[PDB]
Write a structure and sequence with these properties.
mainly alpha, DNA polymerase, domain 1, about 40% helix, about 0% strand, Arf-GAP with Rho-GAP domain, ANK repeat and PH domain-containing protein 3
């Protein structure tokens, strides 16, 4: 099974990046599920209650899942010798 279901607790979604704690502000925002938040962007994450940059890009990188489906993977090849 690829990606997560629409009825997926917002805590289980952020828990993938060790940031499930953010599920609080998320739920209070009217989105307690990855399906109710599906669509949020970077600029939108700022008003969502997120101030950490490294964390913000950590969420969106997971939301992109679907058409490409690519999270937690290497991105380098060769170095010199």
């Amino acid at each position: 099974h690829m990606a997560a279901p629409q009825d997926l607790d917002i805590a289980v979604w952020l828990a993938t990046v060790h940031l499930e704690q953010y599920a609080d502000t998320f739920r209070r925002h009217g989105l307690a599920t990855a399906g109710a938040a599906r669509g949020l962007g970077h600029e939108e994450l700022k008003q969502l209650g997120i101030s950490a940059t490294g964390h913000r890009k950590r969420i969106l990188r997971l939301l992109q899942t679907g058409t490409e489906e690519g999270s937690l993977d290497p991105k380098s090849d060769s170095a010199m010798e």
